[PDB]
Amino acid sequence: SRHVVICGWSESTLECLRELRGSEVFVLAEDENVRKKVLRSGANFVHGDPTRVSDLEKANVRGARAVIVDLESDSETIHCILGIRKIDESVRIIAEAERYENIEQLRMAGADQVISPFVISGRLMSRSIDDGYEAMFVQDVLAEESTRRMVEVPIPEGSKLEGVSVLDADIHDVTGVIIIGVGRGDELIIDPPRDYSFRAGDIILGIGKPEEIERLKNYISA
Amino acid sequence: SRHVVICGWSESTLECLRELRGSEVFVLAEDENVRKKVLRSGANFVHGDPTRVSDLEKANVRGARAVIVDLESDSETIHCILGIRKIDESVRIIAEAERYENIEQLRMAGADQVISPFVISGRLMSRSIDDGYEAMFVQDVLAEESTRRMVEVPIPEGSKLEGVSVLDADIHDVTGVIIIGVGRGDELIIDPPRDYSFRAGDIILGIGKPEEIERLKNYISA
Amino acid sequence: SRHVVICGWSESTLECLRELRGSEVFVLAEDENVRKKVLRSGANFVHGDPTRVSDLEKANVRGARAVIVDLESDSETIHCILGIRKIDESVRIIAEAERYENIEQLRMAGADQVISPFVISGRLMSRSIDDGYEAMFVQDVLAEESTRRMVEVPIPEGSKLEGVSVLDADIHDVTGVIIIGVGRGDELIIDPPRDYSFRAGDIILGIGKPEEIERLKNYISA
Amino acid sequence: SRHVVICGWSESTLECLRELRGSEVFVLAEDENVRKKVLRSGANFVHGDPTRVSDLEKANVRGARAVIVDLESDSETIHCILGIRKIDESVRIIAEAERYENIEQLRMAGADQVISPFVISGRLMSRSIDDGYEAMFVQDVLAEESTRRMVEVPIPEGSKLEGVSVLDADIHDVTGVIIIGVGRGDELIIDPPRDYSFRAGDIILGIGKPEEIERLKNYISA
Amino acid sequence: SRHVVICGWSESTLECLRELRGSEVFVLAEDENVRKKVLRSGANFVHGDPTRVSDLEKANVRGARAVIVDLESDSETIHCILGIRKIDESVRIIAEAERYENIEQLRMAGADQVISPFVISGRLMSRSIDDGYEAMFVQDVLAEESTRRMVEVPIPEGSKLEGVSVLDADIHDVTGVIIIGVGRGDELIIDPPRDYSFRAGDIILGIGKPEEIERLKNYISA
Amino acid sequence: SRHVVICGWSESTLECLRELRGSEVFVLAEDENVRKKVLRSGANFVHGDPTRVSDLEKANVRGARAVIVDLESDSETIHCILGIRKIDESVRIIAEAERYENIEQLRMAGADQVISPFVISGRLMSRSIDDGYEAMFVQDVLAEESTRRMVEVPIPEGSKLEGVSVLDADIHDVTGVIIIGVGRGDELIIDPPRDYSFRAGDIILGIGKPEEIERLKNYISA
Amino acid sequence: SRHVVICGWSESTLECLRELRGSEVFVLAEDENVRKKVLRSGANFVHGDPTRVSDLEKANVRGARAVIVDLESDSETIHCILGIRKIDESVRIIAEAERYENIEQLRMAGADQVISPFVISGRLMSRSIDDGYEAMFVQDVLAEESTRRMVEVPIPEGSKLEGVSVLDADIHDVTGVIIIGVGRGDELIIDPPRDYSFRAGDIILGIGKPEEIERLKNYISA
Amino acid sequence: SRHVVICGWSESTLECLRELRGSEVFVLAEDENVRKKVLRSGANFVHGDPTRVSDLEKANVRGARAVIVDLESDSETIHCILGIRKIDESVRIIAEAERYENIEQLRMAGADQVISPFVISGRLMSRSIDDGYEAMFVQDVLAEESTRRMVEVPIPEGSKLEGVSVLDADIHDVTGVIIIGVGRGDELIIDPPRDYSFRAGDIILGIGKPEEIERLKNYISA
Ligand SMILES: [Ca+2]
Ligand SMILES: [Ca+2]
Ligand SMILES: [Ca+2]
Ligand SMILES: [Ca+2]
Ligand SMILES: [Ca+2]
Ligand SMILES: [Ca+2]
Ligand SMILES: [Ca+2]
Ligand SMILES: [Ca+2]
Ligand SMILES: [Ca+2]
Ligand SMILES: [Ca+2]
Ligand SMILES: [Ca+2]
Ligand SMILES: [Ca+2]
Ligand SMILES: [Ca+2]
Ligand SMILES: [Ca+2]
Ligand SMILES: [Ca+2]
Ligand SMILES: [Ca+2]
Ligand SMILES: [Ca+2]
Ligand SMILES: [Ca+2]
Ligand SMILES: [Ca+2]
Ligand SMILES: [Ca+2]
Ligand SMILES: [Ca+2]
Ligand SMILES: [Ca+2]
Ligand SMILES: [Ca+2]
Ligand SMILES: [Ca+2]
């Protein structure tokens, strides 16, 4: 597919570059001494300032399919998002929020999805006082080393499940995939009710072993 | 319950102190210029160095029920964890990893739950290039304002589900919650197979509306 | 009159606080080492982070008649303007642009007047290679010590100059005030054409000696 | 004509190098990582220390027609001005003042014109509290995009205007330009009184449309 | 035997590398400007970070017979000890403590022996106020130049000394060595009482002339 | 007794001030940020530069019974010893060597006892590769908490052991004190030969339990 | 006489303040921790910044008879010299040059005597490789404790040497001093030729015992 | 001749290296980034620590004809002088004193000549208050650009002046050289008395023009 631009170099973008092996990744950062670690991670390095529109352009923000923005502070992230939305109004921007108060300003500035690692970490630290099964669940289903994988299985056009409710479908009973939520557009319904009718173009968010994912994919086929 | 000691002050401890309303919190940090934001958040401030054992015994580590260690570096976090393990060996420690490679070191040092926010943030960044329902699910089920709540419902002794298999139970059709994992002790089995059988002391990790949570709590009772 | 809030401490805010003798000024800055030099100039100091919304609500942004934003970078200035515009949708914001590319973004964020000192400095530097009369003019008319003064005289409702053109009024021969512009709302017409007709509510931007300014104010009266 | 030397690199010199396109410009600065920016702005780069006389002689200060000094502080600017005056006592130096109190010392060191941007910025931010017509006037007549330009015409020898007063000449009623100042040598008389008689050699500072500029040039001919 | 790894470089490791001549020594340190000193002291140099598990595995920690950790602080030393214990749980670690209070935490992290030089230095400087015979004793029996050496002999299996008390054995009157301690495993009994019976496996710590050392070795034979 | 002067503040001087409870200690150091930690240990602080002779005369070097010199480098230690020896030619100086090459220069400059902690640390590091009984012995006998104590017992004038050899005296069987050396003046004979005869004025350096030390003091009395 | 102001504090100002006993000295420096050593040396301390004009007028630059400028860098020295020349244009400035190339800049800035100690020290170092009588002469004639004194004996009006040539005078055989130079105004003629003739106002620079100085003062009198 | 070793890099050694052009000069310093300026000054660079005896030796201190020692502080200079006197007891050491109190310790440590630039500068600054002819004299006769040169002219064996007094010689009357002093061994007599008898092996210290130096050299010949 098309290339991916990463604005800023930190630990979040380091793990994102670890899971994005194979694709074309350009890294735009100010430090000249991070070129060796960007190239050892298998990505191209572009020396520049990510808040400038000229240097933003140099990294080919127009032709990218997603831009990942993680700079030093929230103000620089909002400024870089405003620059990218000045250049291209249709590209996908994924941003990282350091404070909880700035998620609304990051969404109004033009980010297509805002991720808050300190809010997630604070909620997991507050929830792991009694016993930490939520943090174990999150950190184990995000890893590509366990047996159960959380995948998005799209509903094709003309499928066998067009218009059927969740109760009559029985996806967990046949396929063995735990259906934790179903998504439409930019919205997600976690634990969907029983009178929810499936529509064409939906995204099923599920957890299961890979042969269960194959049986689910063969079950919802055209 | 007892009180909670927090070593270090950051954004993660801000969100943890937000969701810790109703308890007694002692914050131990070296900066004196965080006393105003600690005392506004409903916590006591104890000035000292968290890596030092006398300043740890100032903050009542012994009578605590959990200690949260979020310091600046992983070296300081390991040093503070060993300082806590000097004083009380059986207290619960929830640590935070800055880098991914130090998770095994933080577990060998004595932490009971290691929460790495940047690995979670990078994995939610790279899984949102196409569509971001996974990041929305993760950030939605942890917030205590939405409709669906991720809870831990323990199976009591003398239950009607003791020895009953999960295929014989079929909890989602009767009660309406999604049994996404069953844990006992330190281990968590995500998406358990149908030949798993419950016992007394197992913890059920599930997602549902609070009416469904009350139906599940009344379903597993004697 | 109401008070003025100044975000950030720099040289521009120092000169602005010099020319603001008589008013009530609140200064919101992050450094505590500037408390003496803020208090020496006749302004009350408010310690806080100006890009944070709570520290903006500390300094009474709502009851202010103008907010002067001049922080260390353009990203922080855009973030502070967004934070003020979250609070008061109708307050007047005067901002300072560090780059020429950011003037339109500081205006889209919500500033009413964006003043770029580096662009004016570069354009007065390049216009001084032969003979610097432009820089001498600009730096002489703004100083409140010289003989000629650049003022704004509004046209009262019911003035004798209603409907009169700038050719038929002949302001320079009667009063002595050099008419370099006529303003209406957020628009200024420098060197207005002779067919431009005056209306009540207009602002006349002119240069003249103070006796000539008083003769102009007596001339355009009802 | 000859070349222009620029000692230092900042936003002021960047906008000055924007306005000085087509000419031959040498930029002398310490950082070698600005060479690509100096070349992309159309200027030759000379690596060295601006306060040192050897690197000043490397950058061809002797044959220059103007040197523009904009360094990090006022001590380095004064040191550079004294070095240039050691090399060439007759070249023109345009200096930039960081602080307001160092202007007379920069003039004593040898600068032919001192442009203080933060003083202008503070005075415009102070005058823009009520309504900002002064900042609009300055940033509109300096920007080479709008219709009215602030230009200078010299009075040639034996002109029709030699020895006539401004009340007898009546420049604005015939030509259409607004006479804001007329200056001789290194002085400037803003808003000259009616008894001021013109002499050959004076430079007329005016504002008008370009057709009025050509009419003014055709009127003041010999 | 095998090789010896040294993590860090200081005066302690320099004198240790002086005493460890003839063996095979790898030195792992961050500065690349110590390579000539490591090679001139007769040891191979490995460039890298001692707290990182990758650079620890680069320096052959697995096949080592002892690793000596002497880093800049106690946090880095504890981090390095935990990294080595992640690689090899059975190798011997000799650590150095900077501060006195971190000794038990360095022992908890995994060090087989902690040598605190500044505690010994402070106690010798405190004991040397009246007359300094203790510092003379320590710095004379450790220095391999004087006549009396502090050596260890092991008691072989089935010896003539197996099961006899020290009052019955009378080592100093026959052999001429001064028995200052006899230790088993990881303990040491300095000045053992008369009812202490020897057993096969104990190590006898003594001070004497080398002819007395050979007489002691010939006396305790099987 | 008189007072003790300590030049420089470090870890060695901190432990020396720990073991000096009861005496009058003056600490001469250059940093003012150590005043609390000097005063907390029971020592009066004197701010000054220890390598300067006037600040040495401030802290009453002449009336002191010992001066402990431990500065940041060996050059400053040699300079401080020269400055003290300018003032008092007969005071006792205890110095700390950072390098092995500088012990003879610190002794030629005028120190009475030079204690090198890094050489002892390196020699105990290299003697712990197999089994560390030497380091355990050295760090156990110097601590004033353990069971056995390394003491100095002087021979009074007119003692019963005058003229008696170390073989005929038989100190270990009568008293229990392990005789590891006999000192006379600035000389120590570790493991003295059996033909060595005692004289009045000798110092016996021994190890033993405190009851055995009192039995030795009763045995060698007149 | 009048008072002397000293800008900056270093070792040169220490020796200058030692030889300035009997006068009134005001020391102006930014550090507050030099007040004790300034007040011990018989001088007044004025806290302030020597490059600032208000802190210069605090230290009474106007009524002074000489100002000594020895700051940290040559940029700061030039800035302070121009600050002094703002206030009193005719006062005597004795400056100090850190580097050799800034001597012409320090003279152009307004200093009346520039003293470069490192050029003198390097020239006395390189002229002492064979034998060092030149360094001994330079360091001996400046010390006011030796036998021979370098003085300035002015020739009064109405003298017996007015118009008399130096060959006709032959001052060394009559009075005993060595006439090593005769200066008038700013110029100094070292080793004058025999056709030089004296005038009224010439200063004789000579070396001799104070008896010979009194004989020279009585020889040139009327 | 033989080579010259310079310990440390500063401005004094820079001017010393400027006047020592042609000879073999080795520069021993710790900074690795001064190699380019040492090589551009025409001298060989040796990377090392000048206070270490091993690195001192590497620079071939034994075969040198003079060592010039100018380090950061006086303690390092005394330490390097003690190291050089440990290596070679006959080489010539020229040292630089930063404080006046340490000249005696630098001479006792083994320096053959000690130069104090701050004492010279303080005495010249104190002597230049009235008018600065002493500083002009010193700084002009040390320079190799004026007409008068201060040279050392040795007295040969069997000369015409063996045994003659200063009065009968009349060196200034014949040769024109001002004889300011005569030196023997390590002593200098400035302004020698009239009954001083010349001896073979003396050094005459004189000022004059070069043809006067030639006439003096021909006058005192064998
Ligand atoms: Ca981040
Ligand atoms: Ca839980
Ligand atoms: Ca399943
Ligand atoms: Ca953190
Ligand atoms: Ca996805
Ligand atoms: Ca449900
Ligand atoms: Ca600004
Ligand atoms: Ca112009
Ligand atoms: Ca007028
Ligand atoms: Ca600038
Ligand atoms: Ca206005
Ligand atoms: Ca016009
Ligand atoms: Ca160490
Ligand atoms: Ca003792
Ligand atoms: Ca023996
Ligand atoms: Ca030390
Ligand atoms: Ca051993
Ligand atoms: Ca015993
Ligand atoms: Ca200086
Ligand atoms: Ca010489
Ligand atoms: Ca004489
Ligand atoms: Ca020096
Ligand atoms: Ca004088
Ligand atoms: Ca002559």
CATH code at E124? 1.20.5.870
Tokens standing for residue E181: 């301690």
As a whole number of angstroms, the distance between CA B120 and CA A122 comes to 13
Tokens standing for residue A72: 């030093």
The response to whether G96 counts as a known ligand-binding position is: yes
As a whole number of angstroms, the distance between CA A203 and CA B154 comes to 32
SS (H, E, C) chain C: CCEEEEECCCHHHHHHHHCCCCCCEEEEECCCCCHHHHHHCCCEEEECCCCCHHHHHHCCCCCEEEEEECCCCHHHHHHHHHHHHHHCCCCCEEEECCCCCCHHHHHHHCCCEEECHHHHHHHHHHCCCCCCHHHHHHHHHCCCCCCCEEEEEECCCCCCCCCCEHHHHCHHHHCCCEEEEEEECCEEEECCCCCCECCCCCEEEEEECHHHHHHHHHHCCC
Tell me if chain G has a CB within 8 Å of the CB of D99: no
In angstroms, the first-to-last Cα distance of chain D is 26
Query: CB of H10 within 8 A of CB of H70?
Result: yes
Tokens standing for residue E205: 């710590």
DSSP 8-class letter at D51: T
- Longest distance between any two alpha carbons in chain G, whole Å: 58
Interchain contact, F74 vs H74, CB within 8 Å: no
Q: How deeply is D52 buried, as exposed, middle or buried, from its count of CB atoms within 10 A (0-12, 13-18, 19+)?
A: middle
As a whole number of angstroms, the distance between CA A96 and CA A101 comes to 12
Q: How many CB atoms lie within 10 A of CB B119?
A: 23
- Whether residues H111 and H184 fall in one domain: no
Distance of CA F156 to the CA centre of its chain: 22
Domain CATH number, residue B152 = 3.30.70.1450
Tokens standing for residue D217: 């040039």
- Tell me the nearest-neighbour CA distance from B104 into chain A, angstroms: 14
DSSP 8-class letter at H112: S
Q: How deeply is G48 buried, as exposed, middle or buried, from its count of CB atoms within 10 A (0-12, 13-18, 19+)?
A: middle
Question: Could you write out the DSSP letters of every residue in H29-89?
Answer: ES-GGGHHHHHHTT-EEEES-TTSHHHHHHT--SS-SEEEE--SSHHHHHHHHHHHHHH-S
**CA-CA distances (angstroms) from residue A159 to A150, B130, F195, G154, H80?**
22, 22, 108, 116, 89
Query: CB of G94 within 8 A of CB of G66?
Result: yes
Collapsed DSSP state (helix, strand, coil) of residue A161: coil
Tokens standing for residue C219: 């001339």
- Whether residues D164 and D199 fall in one domain: yes
What phi and psi, each to the nearest 5 degrees, are found at residue A167? -65, -45
| Ligand of minimum distance to the alpha carbon of F178 | 18
Query: CB of B192 within 8 A of CB of B166?
Result: yes
In angstroms, the first-to-last Cα distance of chain C is 26
Length of chain C equals 222
**CA-CA distances (angstroms) from residue B184 to B111, B141, B205, B219, C130?**
19, 22, 11, 20, 85
As a whole number of angstroms, the distance between CA G132 and CA H188 comes to 9
SS (H, E, C) chain E: CCCEEEECCCHHHHHHHHHCCCCCEEEEECCHHHHHHHHHCCCEEEECCCCCHHHHHHCCCCCCCEEEECCCCHHHHHHHHHHHHHHCCCCCEEEECCCCCCHHHHHHHCCCEEECHHHHHHHHHHHCCCCCHHHHHHHHHCCCCCCCEEEEEECCCCCCCCCCEHHHHCHHHHCCCEEEEEECCCCCEECCCCCCECCCCCEEEEEECHHHHHHHHHHCCC
DSSP 8-class letter at D119: H
Sign of the torsion angle spanned by Cα atoms F63, F65, F69, F70: negative
The experimental method behind these coordinates is cryo-EM
DSSP 8-class letter at H102: G
Domain's final residue, options D116, D136, D169: D116
Name every chain H residue with its beta carbon within 8 A of the beta carbon of F51.
74-75
Tokens standing for residue G43: 């001088």
- Whether residues H22 and H52 fall in one domain: yes
As a whole number of angstroms, the distance between CA F117 and CA A159 comes to 80
Query: CB of H216 within 8 A of CB of H177?
Result: yes
As a whole number of angstroms, the distance between CA B84 and CA B90 comes to 10
Pairing state between β F203-208 and F178-184: antiparallel
The response to whether G70 counts as a known ligand-binding position is: yes
- Whether residues A45 and A130 fall in one domain: no
- Whether residues F7 and F95 fall in one domain: yes
- Whether residues D180 and D73 fall in one domain: no
DSSP bridge partners of F153: F204
Length of chain D equals 222
As a whole number of angstroms, the distance between CA B201 and CA B31 comes to 43
Q: How many CB atoms lie within 10 A of CB E91?
A: 19
CB neighbour burial string for D173-189, b if at least 16 within 10 angstroms, e if fewer: eebbbbbbbbbeeeebe
| Ligand of minimum distance to the alpha carbon of E148 | 15
Residue C152 is which amino acid? E
Experimental structure resolution, Å: 3.2
Query: CB of B158 within 8 A of CB of A121?
Result: no
- Whether residues F128 and F216 fall in one domain: no
- Whether residues F54 and F75 fall in one domain: yes
Tokens standing for residue F201: 């004025």
Query: CB of F67 within 8 A of CB of F44?
Result: no
As a whole number of angstroms, the distance between CA C17 and CA C40 comes to 10
Q: Which of D79, D88, D114 best probes binding to G when mutated, by most G CB atoms within 10 angstroms?
A: D79
Q: How deeply is F212 buried, as exposed, middle or buried, from its count of CB atoms within 10 A (0-12, 13-18, 19+)?
A: buried
As a whole number of angstroms, the distance between CA B69 and CA B28 comes to 10
Q: How many CB atoms lie within 10 A of CB F133?
A: 24
Query: CB of G115 within 8 A of CB of H124?
Result: yes
SS (H, E, C) G85-124: HHHCCCCCEEEECCCHHHHHHHHHHCCCEEECHHHHHHHH
- Whether residues A70 and A34 fall in one domain: yes
As a whole number of angstroms, the distance between CA A122 and CA A132 comes to 13
The CA G147 to ligand 19 mean position distance, Å, reads: 30
Q: Which residues contact C117 (CB under 8 A, 6 or more apart)?
A: C12, C96, D117, D118, D120, D121
Pairing state between β C203-208 and C149-154: antiparallel
Q: List B residues 60-89 in contact with A (Cβ-Cβ < 8 A).
A: 65-66, 68, 70
What phi and psi, each to the nearest 5 degrees, are found at residue A151? -125, 165
| Ligand of minimum distance to the alpha carbon of E69 | 13
Interchain contact, F190 vs E98, CB within 8 Å: no
Identity of the residue in G53, G78, G85 whose CB atom sits nearest the CB atom of D79: G78
Interchain contact, C73 vs A78, CB within 8 Å: no
* Sheet of strand E113-115, all strands in order from the earlier edge strand to the far edge: E44-47, E25-29, E4-7, E66-69, E93-96, E113-115
CB neighbour burial string for H31-49, b if at least 16 within 10 angstroms, e if fewer: eeeeeeebeebebebbbbb
Smallest CA-to-CA distance from G54 within G10, G96, G95, G84 is with: G84
CA closest to H85 among chain F residues: F105
The CA B31 to ligand 7 mean position distance, Å, reads: 29
As a whole number of angstroms, the distance between CA C116 and CA D145 comes to 16
Q: 């906008």: which residue's tokens?
A: D15
Q: How many CB atoms lie within 10 A of CB C194?
A: 10
Q: Quick one: which H or E segment has residue D74?
A: helix D74-87
Domain CATH number, residue F93 = 3.40.50.720
- Whether residues B215 and B169 fall in one domain: yes
DSSP bridge partners of C206: C151, C179
As a whole number of angstroms, the distance between CA E119 and CA E126 comes to 10
**CA-CA distances (angstroms) from residue D132 to C111, C151, D126?**
12, 11, 9
Breakpoints of chain H, after residues (C–N > 2.5 Å): none
Q: How deeply is G138 buried, as exposed, middle or buried, from its count of CB atoms within 10 A (0-12, 13-18, 19+)?
A: buried
Q: Which residues contact H205 (CB under 8 A, 6 or more apart)?
A: G133, G134, G137, H150, H151, H152, H179, H180, H181, H182, H183, H188
- Which residues constitute the domain of residue E122? 117-146
Count of domains for chain B: 3
* Sheet of strand F149-154, all strands in order from the earlier edge strand to the far edge: F149-154, F203-208, F178-184, F187-190
As a whole number of angstroms, the distance between CA F150 and CA E210 comes to 24
- Whether residues B66 and B106 fall in one domain: yes
Length of chain B equals 222
Q: 């009802």: which residue's tokens?
A: C222
Query: CB of H208 within 8 A of CB of G191?
Result: yes
Name every chain H residue with its beta carbon within 8 A of the beta carbon of F101.
52-54
As a whole number of angstroms, the distance between CA H71 and CA H6 comes to 10
Smallest CA-to-CA distance from E45 within E54, E58, E53 is with: E58
Tokens standing for residue A69: 């923005």
Name every chain G residue with its beta carbon within 8 A of the beta carbon of D76.
75
Q: Quick one: which H or E segment has residue D183?
A: strand D178-183
- Whether residues F186 and F153 fall in one domain: yes
Smallest CA-to-CA distance from C9 within G17, D35, C25, F105 is with: C25
DSSP bridge partners of E208: E149
As a whole number of angstroms, the distance between CA B142 and CA H82 comes to 70
Residue F119 is which amino acid? V
Tell me if chain G has a CB within 8 Å of the CB of H205: yes
Smallest CA-to-CA distance from D8 within D91, D94, D88 is with: D94
Q: Give CA angle at C149 (C145, C155), nearest 5°.
A: 145
Q: How many CB atoms lie within 10 A of CB G88?
A: 16
Sign of the torsion angle spanned by Cα atoms H106, H108, H110, H111: positive
Question: Could you write out the DSSP letters of every residue in F24-61?
Answer: -EEEEES-STTHHHHHHTT-EEEES-TTSHHHHHHTTS
Q: Give CA angle at F84 (F82, F88), nearest 5°.
A: 120
Collapsed DSSP state (helix, strand, coil) of residue A202: coil
Tokens standing for residue D56: 């000043």
Tokens standing for residue H189: 């007599």
Query: CB of A122 within 8 A of CB of A129?
Result: no
Smallest CA-to-CA distance from E142 within F135, F183, F106, F144 is with: F135
Interchain contact, H205 vs G148, CB within 8 Å: no
As a whole number of angstroms, the distance between CA F84 and CA F90 comes to 10
Sign of the torsion angle spanned by Cα atoms E123, E129, E131, E135: positive
As a whole number of angstroms, the distance between CA A155 and CA A203 comes to 6
As a whole number of angstroms, the distance between CA E12 and CA F117 comes to 9
